[PDB]
Amino acid sequence: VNEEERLINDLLIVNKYNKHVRPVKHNNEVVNIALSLTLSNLISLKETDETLTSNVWMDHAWYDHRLTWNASEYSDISILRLPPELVWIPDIVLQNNNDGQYHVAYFCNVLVRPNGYVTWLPPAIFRSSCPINVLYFPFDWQNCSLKFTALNYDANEITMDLMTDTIDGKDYPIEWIIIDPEAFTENGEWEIIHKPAKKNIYPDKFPNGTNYQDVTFYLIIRRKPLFYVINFITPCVLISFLASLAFYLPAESGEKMSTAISVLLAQAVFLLLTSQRLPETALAVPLIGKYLMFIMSLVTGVIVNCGIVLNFHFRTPSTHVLSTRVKQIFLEKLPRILHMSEIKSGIDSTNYIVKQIKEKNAYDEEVGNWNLVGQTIDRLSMFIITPVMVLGTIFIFVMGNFNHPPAKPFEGDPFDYSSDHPRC
Amino acid sequence: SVMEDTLLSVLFETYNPKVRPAQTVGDKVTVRVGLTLTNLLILNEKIEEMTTNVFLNLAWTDYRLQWDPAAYEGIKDLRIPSSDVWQPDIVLMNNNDGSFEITLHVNVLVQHTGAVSWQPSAIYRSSCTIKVMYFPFDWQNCTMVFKSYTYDTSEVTLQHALDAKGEREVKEIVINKDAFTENGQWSIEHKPSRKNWRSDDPSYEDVTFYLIIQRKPLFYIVYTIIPCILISILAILVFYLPPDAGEKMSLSISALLAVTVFLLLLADKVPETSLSVPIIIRYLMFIMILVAFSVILSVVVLNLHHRSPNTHTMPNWIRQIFIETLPPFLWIQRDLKEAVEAIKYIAEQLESASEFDDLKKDWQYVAMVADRLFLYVFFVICSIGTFSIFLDASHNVPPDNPFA
Amino acid sequence: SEHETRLVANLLENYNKVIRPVEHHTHFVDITVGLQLIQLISVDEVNQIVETNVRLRQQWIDVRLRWNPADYGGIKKIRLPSDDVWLPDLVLYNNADGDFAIVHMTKLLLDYTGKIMWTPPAIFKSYCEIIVTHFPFDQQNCTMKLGIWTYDGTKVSISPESDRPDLSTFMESGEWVMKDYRGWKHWVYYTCCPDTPYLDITYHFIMQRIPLYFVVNVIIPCLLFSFLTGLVFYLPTDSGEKMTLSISVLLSLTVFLLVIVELIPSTSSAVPLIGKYMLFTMIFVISSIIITVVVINTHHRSPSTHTMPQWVRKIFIDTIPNVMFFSTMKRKNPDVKSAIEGVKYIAEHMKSDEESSNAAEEWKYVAMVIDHILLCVFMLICIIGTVSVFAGRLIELS
Amino acid sequence: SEHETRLVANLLENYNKVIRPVEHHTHFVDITVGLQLIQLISVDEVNQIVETNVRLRQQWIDVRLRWNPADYGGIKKIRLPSDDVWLPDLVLYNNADGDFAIVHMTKLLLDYTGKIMWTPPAIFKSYCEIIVTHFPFDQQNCTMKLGIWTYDGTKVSISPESDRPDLSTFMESGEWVMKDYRGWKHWVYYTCCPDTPYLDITYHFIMQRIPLYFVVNVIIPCLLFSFLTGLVFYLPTDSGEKMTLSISVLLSLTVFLLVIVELIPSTSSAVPLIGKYMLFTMIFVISSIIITVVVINTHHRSPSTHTMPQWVRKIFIDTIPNVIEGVKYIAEHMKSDEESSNAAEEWKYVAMVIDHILLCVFMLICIIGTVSVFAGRLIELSQ
Amino acid sequence: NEEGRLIEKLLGDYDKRIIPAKTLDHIIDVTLKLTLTNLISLNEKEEALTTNVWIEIQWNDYRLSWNTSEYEGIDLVRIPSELLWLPDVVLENNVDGQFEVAYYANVLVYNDGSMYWLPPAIYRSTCPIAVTYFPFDWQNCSLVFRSQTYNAHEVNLQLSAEEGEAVEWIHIDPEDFTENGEWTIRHRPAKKNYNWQLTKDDTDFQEIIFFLIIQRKPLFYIINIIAPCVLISSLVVLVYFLPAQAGGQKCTLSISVLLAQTIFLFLIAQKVPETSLNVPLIGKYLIFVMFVSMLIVMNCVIVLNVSLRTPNTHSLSEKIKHLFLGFLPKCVEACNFIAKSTKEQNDSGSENENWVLIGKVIDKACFWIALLLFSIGTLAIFLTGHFNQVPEFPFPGDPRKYVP
Numbered sequence A: 001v002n003e004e005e006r007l008i009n010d011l012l013i014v015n016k017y018n019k020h021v022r023p024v025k026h027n028n029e030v031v032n033i034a035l036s037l038t039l040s041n042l043i044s045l046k047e048t049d050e051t052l053t054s055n056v057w058m059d060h061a062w063y064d065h066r067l068t069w070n071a072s073e074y075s076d077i078s079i080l081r082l083p084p085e086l087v088w089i090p091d092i093v094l095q096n097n098n099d100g101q102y103h104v105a106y107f108c109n110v111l112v113r114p115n116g117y118v119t120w121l122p123p124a125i126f127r128s129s130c131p132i133n134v135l136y137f138p139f140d141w142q143n144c145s146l147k148f149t150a151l152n153y154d155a156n157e158i159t160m161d162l163m164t165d166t167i168d169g170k171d172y173p174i175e176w177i178i179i180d181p182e183a184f185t186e187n188g189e190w191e192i193i194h195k196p197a198k199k200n201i202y203p204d205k206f207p208n209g210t211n212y213q214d215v216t217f218y219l220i221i222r223r224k225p226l227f228y229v230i231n232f233i234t235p236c237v238l239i240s241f242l243a244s245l246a247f248y249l250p251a252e253s254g255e256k257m258s259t260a261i262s263v264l265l266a267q268a269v270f271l272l273l274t275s276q277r278l279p280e281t282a283l284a285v286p287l288i289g290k291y292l293m294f295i296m297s298l299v300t301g302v303i304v305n306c307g308i309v310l311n312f313h314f315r316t317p318s319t320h321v322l323s324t325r326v327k328q329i330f331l332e333k334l335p336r337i338l339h340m341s342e343i344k345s346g347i348d349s350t351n352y353i354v355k356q357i358k359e360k361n362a363y364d365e366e367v368g369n370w371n372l373v374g375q376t377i378d379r380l381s382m383f384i385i386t387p388v389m390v391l392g393t394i395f396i397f398v399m400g401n402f403n404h405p406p407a408k409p410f411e412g413d414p415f416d417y418s419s420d421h422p423r424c
Numbered sequence B: 001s002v003m004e005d006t007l008l009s010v011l012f013e014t015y016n017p018k019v020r021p022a023q024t025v026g027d028k029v030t031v032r033v034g035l036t037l038t039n040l041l042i043l044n045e046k047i048e049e050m051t052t053n054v055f056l057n058l059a060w061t062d063y064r065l066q067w068d069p070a071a072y073e074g075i076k077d078l079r080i081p082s083s084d085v086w087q088p089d090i091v092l093m094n095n096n097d098g099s100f101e102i103t104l105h106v107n108v109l110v111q112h113t114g115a116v117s118w119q120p121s122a123i124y125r126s127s128c129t130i131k132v133m134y135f136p137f138d139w140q141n142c143t144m145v146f147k148s149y150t151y152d153t154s155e156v157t158l159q160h161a162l163d164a165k166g167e168r169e170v171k172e173i174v175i176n177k178d179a180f181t182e183n184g185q186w187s188i189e190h191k192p193s194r195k196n197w198r199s200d201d202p203s204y205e206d207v208t209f210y211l212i213i214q215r216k217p218l219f220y221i222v223y224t225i226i227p228c229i230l231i232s233i234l235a236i237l238v239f240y241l242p243p244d245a246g247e248k249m250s251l252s253i254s255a256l257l258a259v260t261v262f263l264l265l266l267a268d269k270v271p272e273t274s275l276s277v278p279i280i281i282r283y284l285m286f287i288m289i290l291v292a293f294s295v296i297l298s299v300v301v302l303n304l305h306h307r308s309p310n311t312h313t314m315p316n317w318i319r320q321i322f323i324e325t326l327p328p329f330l331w332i333q334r335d336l337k338e339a340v341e342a343i344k345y346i347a348e349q350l351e352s353a354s355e356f357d358d359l360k361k362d363w364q365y366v367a368m369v370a371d372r373l374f375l376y377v378f379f380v381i382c383s384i385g386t387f388s389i390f391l392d393a394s395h396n397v398p399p400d401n402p403f404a
Numbered sequence C: 001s002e003h004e005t006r007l008v009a010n011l012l013e014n015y016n017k018v019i020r021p022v023e024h025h026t027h028f029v030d031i032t033v034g035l036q037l038i039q040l041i042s043v044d045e046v047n048q049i050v051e052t053n054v055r056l057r058q059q060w061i062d063v064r065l066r067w068n069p070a071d072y073g074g075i076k077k078i079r080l081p082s083d084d085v086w087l088p089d090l091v092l093y094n095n096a097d098g099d100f101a102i103v104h105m106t107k108l109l110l111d112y113t114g115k116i117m118w119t120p121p122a123i124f125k126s127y128c129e130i131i132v133t134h135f136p137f138d139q140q141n142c143t144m145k146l147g148i149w150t151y152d153g154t155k156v157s158i159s160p161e162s163d164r165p166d167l168s169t170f171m172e173s174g175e176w177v178m179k180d181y182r183g184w185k186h187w188v189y190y191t192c193c194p195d196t197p198y199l200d201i202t203y204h205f206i207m208q209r210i211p212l213y214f215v216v217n218v219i220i221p222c223l224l225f226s227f228l229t230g231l232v233f234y235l236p237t238d239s240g241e242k243m244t245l246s247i248s249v250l251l252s253l254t255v256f257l258l259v260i261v262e263l264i265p266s267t268s269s270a271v272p273l274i275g276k277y278m279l280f281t282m283i284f285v286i287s288s289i290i291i292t293v294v295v296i297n298t299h300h301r302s303p304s305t306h307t308m309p310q311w312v313r314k315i316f317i318d319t320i321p322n323v324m325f326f327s328t329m330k331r332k333n334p335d336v337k338s339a340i341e342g343v344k345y346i347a348e349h350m351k352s353d354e355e356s357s358n359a360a361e362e363w364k365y366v367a368m369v370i371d372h373i374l375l376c377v378f379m380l381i382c383i384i385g386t387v388s389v390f391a392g393r394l395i396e397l398s
Numbered sequence D: 001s002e003h004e005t006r007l008v009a010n011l012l013e014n015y016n017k018v019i020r021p022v023e024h025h026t027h028f029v030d031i032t033v034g035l036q037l038i039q040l041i042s043v044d045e046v047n048q049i050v051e052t053n054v055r056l057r058q059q060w061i062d063v064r065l066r067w068n069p070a071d072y073g074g075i076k077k078i079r080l081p082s083d084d085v086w087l088p089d090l091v092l093y094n095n096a097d098g099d100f101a102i103v104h105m106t107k108l109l110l111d112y113t114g115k116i117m118w119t120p121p122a123i124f125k126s127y128c129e130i131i132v133t134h135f136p137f138d139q140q141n142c143t144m145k146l147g148i149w150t151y152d153g154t155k156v157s158i159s160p161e162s163d164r165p166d167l168s169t170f171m172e173s174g175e176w177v178m179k180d181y182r183g184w185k186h187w188v189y190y191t192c193c194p195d196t197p198y199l200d201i202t203y204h205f206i207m208q209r210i211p212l213y214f215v216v217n218v219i220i221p222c223l224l225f226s227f228l229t230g231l232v233f234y235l236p237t238d239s240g241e242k243m244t245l246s247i248s249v250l251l252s253l254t255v256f257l258l259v260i261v262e263l264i265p266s267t268s269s270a271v272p273l274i275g276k277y278m279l280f281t282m283i284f285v286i287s288s289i290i291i292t293v294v295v296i297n298t299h300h301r302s303p304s305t306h307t308m309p310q311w312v313r314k315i316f317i318d319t320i321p322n323v324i325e326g327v328k329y330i331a332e333h334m335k336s337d338e339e340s341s342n343a344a345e346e347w348k349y350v351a352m353v354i355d356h357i358l359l360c361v362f363m364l365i366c367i368i369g370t371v372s373v374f375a376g377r378l379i380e381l382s383q
Numbered sequence E: 001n002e003e004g005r006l007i008e009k010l011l012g013d014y015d016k017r018i019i020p021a022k023t024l025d026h027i028i029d030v031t032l033k034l035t036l037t038n039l040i041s042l043n044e045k046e047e048a049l050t051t052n053v054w055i056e057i058q059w060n061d062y063r064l065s066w067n068t069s070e071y072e073g074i075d076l077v078r079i080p081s082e083l084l085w086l087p088d089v090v091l092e093n094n095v096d097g098q099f100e101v102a103y104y105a106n107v108l109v110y111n112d113g114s115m116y117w118l119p120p121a122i123y124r125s126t127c128p129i130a131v132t133y134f135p136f137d138w139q140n141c142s143l144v145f146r147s148q149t150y151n152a153h154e155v156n157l158q159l160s161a162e163e164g165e166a167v168e169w170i171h172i173d174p175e176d177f178t179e180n181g182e183w184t185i186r187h188r189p190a191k192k193n194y195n196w197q198l199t200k201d202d203t204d205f206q207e208i209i210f211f212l213i214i215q216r217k218p219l220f221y222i223i224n225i226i227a228p229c230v231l232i233s234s235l236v237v238l239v240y241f242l243p244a245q246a247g248g249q250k251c252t253l254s255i256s257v258l259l260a261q262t263i264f265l266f267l268i269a270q271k272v273p274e275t276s277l278n279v280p281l282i283g284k285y286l287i288f289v290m291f292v293s294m295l296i297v298m299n300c301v302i303v304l305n306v307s308l309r310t311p312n313t314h315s316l317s318e319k320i321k322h323l324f325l326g327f328l329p330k331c332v333e334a335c336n337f338i339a340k341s342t343k344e345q346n347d348s349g350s351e352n353e354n355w356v357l358i359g360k361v362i363d364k365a366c367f368w369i370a371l372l373l374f375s376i377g378t379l380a381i382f383l384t385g386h387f388n389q390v391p392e393f394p395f396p397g398d399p400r401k402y403v404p
């Protein structure tokens, strides 16, 4: 018959294997819980909820002096399998999580070897809390982390370490997140750049407390901004170019104000859209948000200038008198600077008609000078506003594109935490 | 065998977690409660619910869980699963949803003297009344109430949790600097803990962790207040476009449409409570009514501009009030004989047309003076309104004494 | 305390969870059921579901759970987990998207005389017919029905604790005021088992909506647009802009239609007051646009192809302006002969132009008088409509 | 039946559910695994997750659960709850946002020879690698990997029931047509243990999206907006509504940009074909607005400020169209006004000619762009 | 209490994992009867129908029988469902993973062994949407109850019988039933269906189907959506009466009605199902009005081009002028130069007036055509919607009425 039944019975029922007891011969000893992580795929980093949903394969490894047997005494059984409900397991609990799901999601069988070495690989779905730095959104990189703390025991009872492999006869500790290239697919919006793994010890807390030890896995992920470039950045900058060209419309048509108004409305609509994609945190304004505010205040100034030009275009002689200084500056110096290109009743009635024609012609010349003033201030406003906004947009987007995570994950550490360069 | 197993066998051979640990009949169990806020997740003002990730510190003395460490192998403390020892069910009495108990169920820490220190963790969802007034430049008084659901004062006695030094007592929420990540929207101003009683019911004991939190209004002042200020600037400009441009009403109605769009967007964010009106909604309504009055007065100015002698006759009072007194106070001032018969006729027509033009230009002057007066009045009114609203908002500082 | 361990071990030696707590099977256990409402969570009008956080309080006397206190050190009251004792299967009849019975199963109280006072918490997502006729000033009558499912009156009877539900610790909701609240116990005979009576308690809560939130958010902008729609008739047609104002306020009313439709349930049992007012202002703005097109037409009526009828001229130039009192409306050589002929020709052209302009001015005058009449009648219509659709419920409240 | 009760009691007197159902530990249990898809719930291409209501079919032989029917009244088949027998721990390897293994734990058939036949219902949320290159006329090929999580080869063997998944009881979905489906079983070896293979089954589904919904809710309004922009130039620049129409079409396309943001997934791996089309028409309307600004400026070009160059006149009038003292004073003033009006007439003629050119060019560009972005995928689908 | 010892004796030797068959090849008749009480909602987005029902399951168990005279006349005990064998009748066509009932009420074990289990349940049964005639559309939603474990060779699903007449309908008691107000129960039939493609010993050979031919009440949608949309689309008829002038607003009004149609499209898209099988009737009406309004805009730009055809740009051929005007039946030389210029401008103005008249004739003819087209399209679409009556018989090939 099967030889595993007698061995499992001997290990558990005959030996009185208590599940709720640490696997140590003495109480003063410690249990070394080797730990590792394997990211199957990054599901989504929901910005609005500040939640990182990941599908990981937690890897535990410890020693149990009760789970040992002689291989030759049981017909050469090299390995064993046991469900978690029957063996002592360290409850490594994800401390930071937005939902109530603290534990792993499956509780798969553990594997026990005759030397006592026990490995456990339960898959899990963890929705951790990631404080999102929105400073350079959308050309931004995050620093989401997972904090694994053993809350059931203190650091004087178990010590959490990092699992070590053997390469060329020397042990190299796995200080990174294990990713199998064949079994992992890149997320549709996020790309992993750095995946450091660290063990933190807090000296200001006592060892007998439950907060003395900590194992943290970091995921420095960079957003691929292609979708936002296609759908948000490009339409916004192209619509802002219409605000730039609004000065090219003439004052004669009743469209000078309408195009600027419609461009401002489009900018406000994009502001309405982008308000629903980023958290309401007040640490800093997003890059796209502050660019939107800059271009919106600029197009508000554009509309103010359009109103000023429209006022100066319709200034009749009956309501305003053309000042001499304006007649100099906005008509002579600026255009050359900017390179802008019973017969008594009959004769009395004829004289009156000619006088009225002369008055109408003088009125027309005065309003023509006003129109030229409007065109000149319009050209100056264009040459002031369009280059400053083009330079502003280029500057802010170059600053966004140059925002890259540093080569070293930690600034005070020459180590790079790369799977291809292990140390020690 | 490891002696921990034998000690666990000895302790629980007759233990029952269904009985109070009162040593003598009618005695009370002094239960110490406290909080360790690790993360303030979110404060959903739509449903008046606060979600927090906390470490509920507990400490009660059980007389049955006693042993002599010298008798055993020097064991001075033990970790026991929370479902095996008696437990006072400190639940969140003011939860918004049905989640009463604790989530994680970590192991308790039983020492040889009998003192049990249990520190379970949970994602609690409490409910607090939102002070909708002064939103978003507002401070909230959201509270969490912790007391035994089943036992009352005749059976337990709630107290305050101690510190690392046992000689000191803590009357505030403990924050661990290593683990606490600051919420990006709320700032913890005060966090006192005080047992409030009931005068009308002696059999009631409570421990409430008041949490005075201040909203950081930068998001709302960036996405709503600044666009509303820009729209107000546009609305003031409506009283500066000439009537001949044919764009005054277009600009004003576009500003009104923008204001209503921003009003409808905030409907997803402002609370649904009808007790009062938040200061941002009050400001939105003020701006909307101002823009509506701008639309009405620009309609009036257009009517005054397009009036003519053949359709209106100018009353004397409007002349005396808009040509005489107000322009000083607004800096505004100023065979063959048949051909002879025909030229006389066309000259008389030109004279009549010029008189008509003079009268309609007087109408235009009245319209322009009224437009400038509306410009100044609206500028003063909007500036005073914004200053008063922002002064009221800026003085909404939470009091330095939290009253615990 | 070992006294309490002795008591709890002795009580549950032979206790059976699934057996009725009566001395003889012909009897019935008198359960005193009461309800206290801690807080009203939300009222979902689109689904007709009202969610309440209540503490259902059941009291019944169990004969198998009595002891003499002097035998056990003087203990009079203890606590037991609810899963260890027989429980009534109180179930919300009109449940919707929720739990039908108690699921949290907190501990209870056990007096030495066998009296049990169990007060578990619950969240009752009840299903009440949301009557929406007077929204948002509506007065909903939402109720929850509690009864014993498997048993009937002759086996396990229930009785209300007090004629009104407890509201001593009621947390004041931000949008509902409890006008009234009362509980009645009915005696109904179901079709499945008509031979024996079935008991239930029907707690009804007369709630009315606090309307300030909806008045500020929705009704005030609608009133503003209804005020603005009448203003189009005061805007002169010479600007060529009244079409913009009318279509813009039309679009605004369309957006408010979009936001109002989602608020009310889709039930056709009644048309809400806000819905009737919204349809009224939609009809108002549609008719204002139509008559704006009419007055634009009569503003641009070319006298070349149109002659002004006598009757409309009389009515709109001779009587209506006289009626108005508050407005300011009025009440030898070839070259020489070629030059002479040119003067005659330009004079004739000027005379024809002046005749055409005078006729056009008369058309403008007719259009403006029509606009004034429309302004007055539309202001009166909007005021009367607002009063008719809202003042009825306002005086009904008073 | 009393026979059934005594048989079930006898079968589980000493049955152990944590022991592999194999005669000897060196051998392996042969587990036949099939699948039948009941109904595809939805395809969440935003998170790259497909949820399918399936009934996983597992059958294996247990040597401890056999009995002679003649000893128990002739019973040949019984049913037991799945929690009372050893079960293979089939885990969705690419599970995302859902459960990993069977959670419903339904009862299973048990033949008298030990032939266990288990068909538990489950909902699988696989990590479907979404390819959006030809959205919405796209073809998704994504799998659902199944395998024994803890055991491996030479301990528990898994083999497919048939080369194709069962689709007899499939409910026809509203947005997908099941083109092809097949299953394969792999053998993965590790250098640490080269002698022990690792087994799994990869069930791939070739699915084509039914594009009627996206065509009627997205493509038709986009085509209408692309046609309206080409009709702007016929409208003369004298009614004052040309730029009004242009900015109104721009605002309508912004509203439809809101709609399309609500609809299309946020994947930066590749630009969707509908994304390329909407970017094309957005570039088109931006360019149309720019050139309408230009032609409006040309229309109101006062002759005093700008003098007409020779090349513009040559290209827009010749090639494309073929393809007492006061009396003298007012006479001179009217002559000057007539000269200015003739020059403005030349400017208006240039505006009208360039309007015709832009009308023809823009409509041909719209047709060519729509054909290049749609007819290629339609040709690929037809062939 | 006799009930205690009776229940103790009944369940003393009782395995809840064994189907009750008194002998080999003995089937058990499981009878069903659905009692609808509250039709919660029909979610078009998720194609799920949520119902609150009292499913009545009756079978016979030979083990749960006793004799009344031996237990002081008791003939009805009540046993919780968790301690008894069940037929495992679940809702097969469930959208979520909810197969079983939501409460597990106690059963009524009668004297002779007849079982009466009546558990309430919240069932979300999937239902394909007949979107074609939206919103005046009647739906055909079904609930499938089959035993998910036992095949048709072990249990025999049937329908309940009151007095010998089969209950082939969903029983509704007006004592505790309220109308949904949005869906009306027009037909409520029920029938046992077989799947002959599967053999008898297959699990899914037999099932019970409760149909619900629910017709949507259209008054709310008519008031809120259909009438406002047909009122908006009525305004493009008025466009042809606006002048073809710069001060007029033909194009502005047309594109504003088009924007209103776009807002309607964004509205109803959030309400219609996402199924790609067909296009909803309201969607067809939206497409029709958007296409006809694009034709309105095209005619607007055509008439604006025609009425502004200056003689300096276009030429007026006499043939087209005949075609459209026939459609009505349904040191002194300065003065000479001035006269010549006046004659030239009068000729150009007369030709422009002729062009304006051509545009007016186009406006009248296309106005009548567009009015007729819009009216006939709206009337045909809405008459198709109104004539979408529920079929008189629940099953078209069956003369039975399936109503008590």
Ligand SMILES: *[C@@H]1O[C@H](CO)[C@@H](O[C@@H]2O[C@H](CO)[C@@H](O)[C@H](O)[C@H]2NC(C)=O)[C@H](O)[C@H]1NC(C)=O
Pocket: A206, A208, A209, B164, B165, B166, B167
């Ligand atoms: C954990 O160890 C620390 C350090 O020994 C203990 O802290 C001591 O607490 C006592 C009682 O309050 C004080 O008198 C000592 O001064 C503390 N020591 C220090 C260094 O601060 C603490 O009690 C231990 N905790 C447990 C549960 O054993």
